[PDB]
Amino acid sequence: TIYGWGHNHRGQLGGIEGAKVKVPTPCEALATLRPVQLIGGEQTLFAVTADGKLYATGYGAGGRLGIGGTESVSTPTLLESIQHVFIKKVAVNSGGKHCLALSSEGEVYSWGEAEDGKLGHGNRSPCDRPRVIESLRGIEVVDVAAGGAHSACVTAAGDLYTWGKGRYGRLGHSDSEDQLKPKLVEALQGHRVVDIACGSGDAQTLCLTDDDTVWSWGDGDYGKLGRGGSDGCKVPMKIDSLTGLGVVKVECGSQFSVALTKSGAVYTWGKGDYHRLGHGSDDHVRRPRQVQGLQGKKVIAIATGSLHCVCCTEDGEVYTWGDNDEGQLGDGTTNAIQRPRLVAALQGKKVNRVACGSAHTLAWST
Numbered sequence: 001t002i003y004g005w006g007h008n009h010r011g012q013l014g015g016i017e018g019a020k021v022k023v024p025t026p027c028e029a030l031a032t033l034r035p036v037q038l039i040g041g042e043q044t045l046f047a048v049t050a051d052g053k054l055y056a057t058g059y060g061a062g063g064r065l066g067i068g069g070t071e072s073v074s075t076p077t078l079l080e081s082i083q084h085v086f087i088k089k090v091a092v093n094s095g096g097k098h099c100l101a102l103s104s105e106g107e108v109y110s111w112g113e114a115e116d117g118k119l120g121h122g123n124r125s126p127c128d129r130p131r132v133i134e135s136l137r138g139i140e141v142v143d144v145a146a147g148g149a150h151s152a153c154v155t156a157a158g159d160l161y162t163w164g165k166g167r168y169g170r171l172g173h174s175d176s177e178d179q180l181k182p183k184l185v186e187a188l189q190g191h192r193v194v195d196i197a198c199g200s201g202d203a204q205t206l207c208l209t210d211d212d213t214v215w216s217w218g219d220g221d222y223g224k225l226g227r228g229g230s231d232g233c234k235v236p237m238k239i240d241s242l243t244g245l246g247v248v249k250v251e252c253g254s255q256f257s258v259a260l261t262k263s264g265a266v267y268t269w270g271k272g273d274y275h276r277l278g279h280g281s282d283d284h285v286r287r288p289r290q291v292q293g294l295q296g297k298k299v300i301a302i303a304t305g306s307l308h309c310v311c312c313t314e315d316g317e318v319y320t321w322g323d324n325d326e327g328q329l330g331d332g333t334t335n336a337i338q339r340p341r342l343v344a345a346l347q348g349k350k351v352n353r354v355a356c357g358s359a360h361t362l363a364w365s366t
Contacts, residue, residue: 006360011074040357052086063128148200158192223286
């Protein structure tokens, strides 16, 4: 079984009834795929199968689904043009309209909107089906991440590349220039990148290196870089207050940042409007702050949408908080939740995987 909820007005959840699905509901069509990954963008959902196949559902505008054309679909639809490739991971931002896909051969495919050079093909021409990024061929790529207007990947050697919109420093090349093809982030050389996340709007980028250090750069508004105040920067800089804490994952939602530790702690910081941070007030938070509503709960996975979070613990409790205008919190309402709250309908369901898109949410058990 795979449970899905939240906004479903354009087929986001792959075939179930209701423009808003306000309680976790079985999504049979997604379950039949036995996905190894589910990840959503702006009104979209992508599924990766065990045999490396890619399916998409939801809003088709701009060629964001990668199935061909711009029609929307309401059932998981095979990306046929790439079925000869074994895909192991898709990257899409919760608020994004383009994807990266990583093959077993360490190559990157991209599709969707092409504004700002985010597809990485050396121009701003849209690709409605997945296309290999040629300038990365011969380099073993091992991870991919996507922002609202930018893109990133990590190589076997631990090097980071970013590309797309340069404004406000999100690429990290010490300037504001757009990059139409992947460009090595030189300031991080000598540190091995092990996790990467990219934001939306006037965006930040976050990463984790293997020396127990978290980095942030790009747009500073609302404190989402985590160094106090609101100054942006154009080159990776450490968030010193996270050093030594055993961070294992970073994520970005809309104007906010998240870290999960080996110990199971969740930290959030950035824009506080609409309760996205989960601290129990809408104040902006300008340095990483532990989410005290998850104190002593051993969180093993977290996912962000634009304005909401979902996470699960070792024992299968699922928590959401943030905005609920589309029912994405899964409590039967469209009322915001200020602090993490257990998802009642999932109690007993043994969930160990969670995912989001812009305003929709999935949870399941392997």
